[PDB]
Amino acid sequence: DKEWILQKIYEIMRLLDELXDAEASMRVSDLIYEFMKK
């Protein structure tokens, strides 16, 4: 479930964006980028 991995992780990213971390959202999105790319 690599695509379900992407699913869970971008749900994490959307919730991070809503919580207002901004910081966490941006570079954990860097994490997800280097996750789905690699």
Place this chain on the structure above:
Amino acid sequence: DKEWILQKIYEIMRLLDELXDAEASMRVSDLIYEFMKK
């Protein structure tokens, strides 16, 4: 490989347990068990 990714999910669960989301921590933890397994 998948080591870096599951370590990413480790960092994610650590960020969660530092934030304060008991529900979300249990979610990502059970998903981590079902991601090491499946």
Place this chain on the structure above:
Amino acid sequence: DSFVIRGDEVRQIAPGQTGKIADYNYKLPDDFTGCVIAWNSNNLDSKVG
């Protein structure tokens, strides 16, 4: 040039990687010694909203 780089992406000046928008063109190929003078944009590059 001057573009607001992400935090660590000041270090993504290294070949082969996918960038946030350097996906289009950037990412040092063979012998691009493109001079860069960088710093923390944290003076004003963060806005209410």
